[PDB]
A paper describes a structure:
Hb is responsible for ensuring oxygen (O2) distribution in the body by binding and transporting O2 from the lungs to tissues. A number of aromatic aldehydes that bind and increase Hb affinity for oxygen have been studied by our group for their potential therapeutic application in SCD treatment. These aldehydes form Schiff base adducts with the N-terminal αVal1 amines at the α-cleft of Hb to stabilize the R-state Hb and prevent hypoxia-induced HbS polymerization.
Similar chemical hydrolysis of the organic molecule nitrate esters to release NO, and crystallization has been reported.
Author numbering:
A (entry chain B), D (entry chain D): 1 to 146
B (entry chain A), C (entry chain C): 1 to 141
C-alpha cells in the first residue's frame, strides 16, 4: 500500500485514539448484523440471534480485539502487507474458505465504525487514506486464494 | 427486499437528514471521488474540487432523489424510472460504483448521526441503498 | 428489475425447458458441487456423488421453485417468502453461492438448448436468476 | 493455477476443437448483451444498440479474436498465468480501470459459450476444469489491482 507521508501521519494519529478493547468488537459485530450470512462462520460464538445479542456477545468482543490487532499490524507494515498477512491468508483461504468479497466488507464496516466514533474528525481525506489501508489488508488476506 | 423493520429504520434515520440533504450528499460524493478516484470518470464536465458549487448542487439532487425513494420505498422501479434510464441506459454506470457511493453515504451518515447509526439501522440503510442501486442499474423499459 | 421483454423471454425460454426443468436443476447442482466444492458445505448429509438420487430429487425441488417464480414473476417476494426464510434466515447462505448456482444453471441451459439459448434469452434469464437470488438472500418475512 | 493432469488433458482436448475465429467474439458479444454497462468501454466499436447489432458487429468479432488468443496463451502457460497476463493486466487495470468483477463475468460468459458449442461434451468435470482456468485468468488480469 502506498500512502503519502501526510496520509500515513493522519492515519497514525487517528489510530492512536482508537479504543483497542472496543472498536474491533464493534466492527466484527456490525459485520455479523449487516451481513448476516457471515454468522455461519461464527456459530461457536453462541447467541447471535438479534443485533443486540450480537453486539453484546462476549465472544464477539473478544475475537474483535484480535481482528483489530491484525489491522494494527498492517498499519505498522504498510509496505509489506502480503508478508504480514501470509499466515492469516492461509487460515482464511485454505482452512475457513471465506469468500474474499467478505474481506472487503469487514474493511468497509471498520471504516464505518471509525466514522461513527470520530465524527467530523474522520474527514474525506482521512477516509481516503483508510480506504487504501483496508483494501491492502483485504488484498493481502486474499493473496493465498490466487 | 426490505422488511417492515427496515422501512421503519430507513424512514427514521433518513428523515433526520432533512435540510442537510445537499451538504450530506455533496460530502458523500466528495468522499467517493477522493477515496475511489476511478469514479471521477463519470463526471468529466464537473469541477470536482473540495468546495465545488457544482458538487454541492449535484449532491442535493442525489439526496433528494433518495428522499423520494424513501417515500416510495414500496414502489421504487416506478418512482425511479427516469433515474434508471439515466444511469443504466445513458450513462452505463458500472454496478460497482453504486456500492462505492452507497458506502460513502453510510460513512457520511455515521459521521453526522452517531446516535441514529445503530447496527440495526446501518443494516437497514445498507439494504435500502442496495435496492436503490439495483433499480438504477436495471434496464427495465 | 425485469423489463416486459425480459418477462416474455423468461416465460418463453422456461416453457422451452418444459418437462426437463427438474433434470436441469439436478445437473446445475452437480455442476456447482464439482466446480465450486465450497458449496458442498451447505449439504453435509447429502449423497453428492455423481447421479445420486438425492441430488436428482433436490434438483426437481429447485426447478419447481423456479417454475413457481416464473409464474409469479411480478410478485416473487410473496411467492418465495418461505424459501427466503429458509435460505436467508435459517441457513444463512452466502450470496456468492447464489451467483455460482445461477451460473451453473445458465451453463446447463446452454449445454441443452443449442437452438434456443439466444443472447437475449441468456440476458433475460440472468436477470431472472439474479432477481430470485435477491429474494432468497433477503430477510423480509 | 493447479489443475490435475487429467484436468489439463480435458481442457486442452476441448480447446483444440474451439473455433479461434468466432468463439471470442461470441463471448465478448454476449458480455455486452448480458451486462450492458460493459458497452461503456467500447464506444469506438460502432452500433451496439440491439443484440443483433452486438453479435454481428465486425469490431466485436475482430477484437474477440484477440481476447480468445489471450485465453489460448493462458492455456499454454497454465503454471504462469500472472506473468502471461502482465501486459494485459496493466492495460486493463492501470489504463482502462476495468473493474475486476467484469473479468470474472467475461470468463463465465466464455464458459457459457463453450457449453453452447459443445453441448453434452461440456461435462461437469470439463466445466470444473475450465472454471479453474477462467478464475486464474481473471485473477491474473486483476494483478495490477493487488
Ligand atoms: C480484513 C479482514 C479480516 C481480518 C484482519 C481478520 C483477522 C482475523 C484474525 C487475527 C483471526 C485470529 C486468527 C488466530 O487466532 O490465529 C481471525 C480468525 C477468524 N476469522 Fe478473520 N479476519 C478478517 C476477515 C474475516 C471475515 C470477513 C470472516 C468471515 C466472514 C472471517 C472469519 C474468521 C473466523 C471464522 C475466524 C476464527 C474465529 C474462531 O473460531 O475463533 N474473517 N481473523
Ligand atoms: C444511490 C445512488 C445514486 C443516486 C440516488 C443517484 C441520483 C442521481 C440524480 C438525482 C441525478 C441527477 C438527475 C438530474 O439532474 O436530472 C444523477 C445524475 C448522475 N449520476 Fe447518479 N445517482 C446515484 C449513483 C451514481 C453513481 C454510483 C454514479 C457514478 C459513479 C453516478 C453518476 C451520475 C452521473 C454521471 C450523473 C449525471 C451528472 C450530470 O452530468 O449532470 N450516479 N444521479
Ligand atoms: C435459484 C436459487 C435457489 C433456489 C430456487 C433454491 C430452492 C430450494 C428449494 C426448493 C429447497 C427445498 C425446500 C424444502 O425442502 O422445503 C432448497 C433447500 C436448500 N437449499 Fe436452496 N435454492 C437455491 C439456491 C441455493 C444455494 C445457492 C444454496 C447453497 C449453496 C442452497 C442451499 C440449500 C440447502 C442447504 C437446502 C436444504 C437442503 C436440505 O437440508 O434438505 N440453495 N432450496
Ligand atoms: C477477462 C478476460 C479478458 C481478456 C483475456 C481480455 C483481453 C484483451 C486483449 C487481448 C485486448 C487487446 C490488447 C491489445 O491489442 O493491445 C484487450 C483490450 C481491451 N479490453 Fe479486454 N480482455 C478481458 C476482459 C475485458 C473486460 C471485462 C473489459 C470491459 C468490460 C475489457 C475491455 C477492454 C478494452 C476497452 C480494450 C481496448 C479496446 C480498444 O479500444 O481497442 N476487457 N482485452
Ligand atoms: C431488498 C434488497 C436487499 C438487497 C437488495 C439488492 O437489490 O435488495
Ligand atoms: C431486475 C434485476 C437485475 C438484477 C437484479 C438483482 O436483484 O434484479
Amino acid at each position: 500500500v502506498h500512502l503519502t507521508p501526510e496520509e500515513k501521519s493522519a492515519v497514525t494519529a487517528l489510530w492512536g485514539k482508537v479504543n483497542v478493547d472496543e472498536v474491533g468488537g464493534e466492527a466484527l459485530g456490525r459485520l455479523l448484523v449487516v451481513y448476516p450470512w457471515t454468522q455461519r462462520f461464527f456459530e461457536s460464538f453462541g447467541d447471535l440471534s438479534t443485533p443486540d445479542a450480537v453486539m453484546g456477545n462476549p465472544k464477539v468482543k473478544a475475537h474483535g480485539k484480535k481482528v483489530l490487532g491484525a489491522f494494527s499490524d498492517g498499519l505498522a507494515h504498510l509496505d509489506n502487507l502480503k508478508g504480514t498477512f501470509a499466515t492469516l491468508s492461509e487460515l482464511h483461504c485454505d482452512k475457513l474458505h471465506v469468500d474474499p468479497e467478505n474481506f472487503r466488507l469487514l474493511g468497509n464496516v471498520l471504516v464505518c465504525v471509525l466514522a461513527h466514533h470520530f465524527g467530523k474528525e474522520f474527514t474525506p481525506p482521512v477516509q481516503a487514506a483508510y480506504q487504501k489501508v483496508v483494501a491492502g489488508v483485504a488484498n493481502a488476506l486474499a493473496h493465498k486464494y490466487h | 427486499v426490505l422488511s417492515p423493520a427496515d422501512k421503519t429504520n430507513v424512514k427514521a434515520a433518513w428523515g433526520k437528514v432533512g435540510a442537510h440533504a445537499g451538504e450530506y450528499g455533496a460530502e458523500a460524493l466528495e468522499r467517493m471521488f477522493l477515496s475511489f478516484p476511478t469514479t471521477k470518470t463519470y463526471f468529466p464536465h464537473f469541477d470536482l474540487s473540495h468546495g465545488s458549487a457544482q458538487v454541492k448542487g449535484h449532491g442535493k439532487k442525489v439526496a433528494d432523489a433518495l428522499t423520494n425513494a424513501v417515500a416510495h420505498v414500496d414502489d421504487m422501479p416506478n418512482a425511479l424510472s427516469a433515474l434508471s434510464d439515466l444511469h443504466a441506459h445513458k450513462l452505463r454506470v458500472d454496478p460497482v460504483n453504486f456500492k462505492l457511493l452507497s458506502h460513502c453515504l453510510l460513512v457520511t451518515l455515521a459521521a453526522h448521526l452517531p446516535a441514529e447509526f445503530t447496527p440495526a439501522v446501518h443494516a437497514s440503510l445498507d439494504k435500502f441503498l442496495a435496492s436503490v442501486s439495483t433499480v438504477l442499474t436495471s434496464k427495465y423499459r
